[PDB]
Amino acid sequence: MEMEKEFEQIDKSGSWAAIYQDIRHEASDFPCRVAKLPKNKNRNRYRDVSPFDHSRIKLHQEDNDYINASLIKMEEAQRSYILTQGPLPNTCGHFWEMVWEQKSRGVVMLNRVMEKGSLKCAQYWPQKEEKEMIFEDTNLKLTLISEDIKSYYTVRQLELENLTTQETREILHFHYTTWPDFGVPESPASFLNFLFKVRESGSLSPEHGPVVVHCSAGIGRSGTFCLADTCLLLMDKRKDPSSVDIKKVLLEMRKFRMGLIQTADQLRFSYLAVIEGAKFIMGDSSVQDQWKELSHEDL
Ligand SMILES: CC(C)(O)CCOc1ccc2cc(O)c(N3CC(=O)NS3(=O)=O)c(F)c2c1
Ligand SMILES: [Cl-]
Ligand SMILES: [Cl-]
Ligand code: NA
């Protein structure tokens, strides 16, 4: 593939940092006026990570519609994602309000609550069936229904209830627990095994609202996940691996949220994941079982 040839050339010349810096230099800069309003200071986890105004998710409330969340609409791939920061103690109600209003079926969490000795995300979902969470400010209730615990990720089935109408929805929560802050997954196989677990759930399908993807800031790990998924979907459309330009796809995504993919090694890993995933897209369905084995998800 042209993607494989490009990877080989960058590796041989040792120019991942330069390629990655080129992307940062060419990336879109759009205003984030709402994110920077004084009233929204305590709704942002990081001073330097904000949603662009043009693509921010608006909460459907009159008081304050702001959440640090972006709609990434990949027009050619025909898939949308919401990328958001790890909720703060005061924005967990907003987070589930967004999930409800945007009709999302899945939440993909790529971080842990504590990383490198600091708190990176609130405990925004219940870990025990009998201890449900009630978000009084947004009139929502959230109950853990079941979970499937694997070695490096956990899938949870949640029930989200609109307390105003008593309507309920199933939310699937995919928690990747071994992807370090500013780091990469253990292998392409472990990443792809997890990505296709998300896909198989239906959470990425167009009948539902956009999947909500987050890490701590919602850009490094979240960007890597969504770049790989979109590239594999583009390749699927006409079964043509050489028709995917990873750097171009990443620049397109960065029109919708700043800073997606935060290290040169996350960019390199993205290539690895797409190159390996291409084996499945191009017709070797058996490689999915191989990824499951190589991921050691039982062990
Ligand atoms: C957009 C810009 C100009 O580059 C400024 C980026 O400023 C920041 C500030 C704090 C961060 C904290 C994170 O934990 C983080 N993560 C690393 C990962 O791999 N995933 S992440 O959770 O998104 C970030 F990327 C951050 C980026
Ligand atoms: Cl740690
Ligand atoms: Cl970490
Ligand atoms: Na190869």
Numbering used by the authors: 1 to 299
Passage from the reporting paper:
PTP1B and PTPN2 are two of the most closely related members of the PTP superfamily, sharing a high degree of catalytic domain sequence and structural identity, but differing in their non-catalytic N- and C-terminal segments. PTP1B is targeted to the cytoplasmic face of the endoplasmic reticulum (ER) by a hydrophobic C-terminus, but can access substrates at the plasma membrane and after receptor endocytosis. These studies have identified PTP1B and PTPN2 as intracellular T cell checkpoints, with analogous functions to those mediated by the cell surface T cell inhibitory receptor PD-1. We demonstrate that Compound-182 is a highly potent and selective active site competitive inhibitor of PTP1B and PTPN2 that enhances T cell recruitment and activation and represses the growth of tumors in mice, without promoting overt immune-related toxicities.
To gain insight into the molecular basis for Compound 182’s selectivity for PTP1B and PTPN2 over other PTP family members, we solved the structure of PTP1B in complex with Compound 182 using X-ray crystallography. Briefly, the phosphate position was occupied by the acylsulfamide ring with the carbonyl oxygen atom displacing a conserved water molecule that is usually hydrogen bonded to Gln26651. This placed the edge of the acylsulfamide ring above the catalytic Cys215 in such a way that the hydrogen-bond network that normally exists between PTPs and the phosphate of their substrate pTyr was largely maintained. The PTP1B/Compound 182 structure reveals that the 3-hydroxy-3-methylbutoxy tail of Compound 182 is likely responsible for its specificity towards PTP1B and PTPN2. The terminal methyl group abuts Gly259 and anything larger than a Gly at this position would clash with Compound 182. Finally, the naphthalene core would clash with any reside larger than Ala at position 217. Since, amongst the 37 classical human PTPs, the combination of Ala217, Gly259, and Val49 is unique to PTP1B and PTPN252 we hypothesize that these residues are responsible for Compound 182’s remarkable specificity.
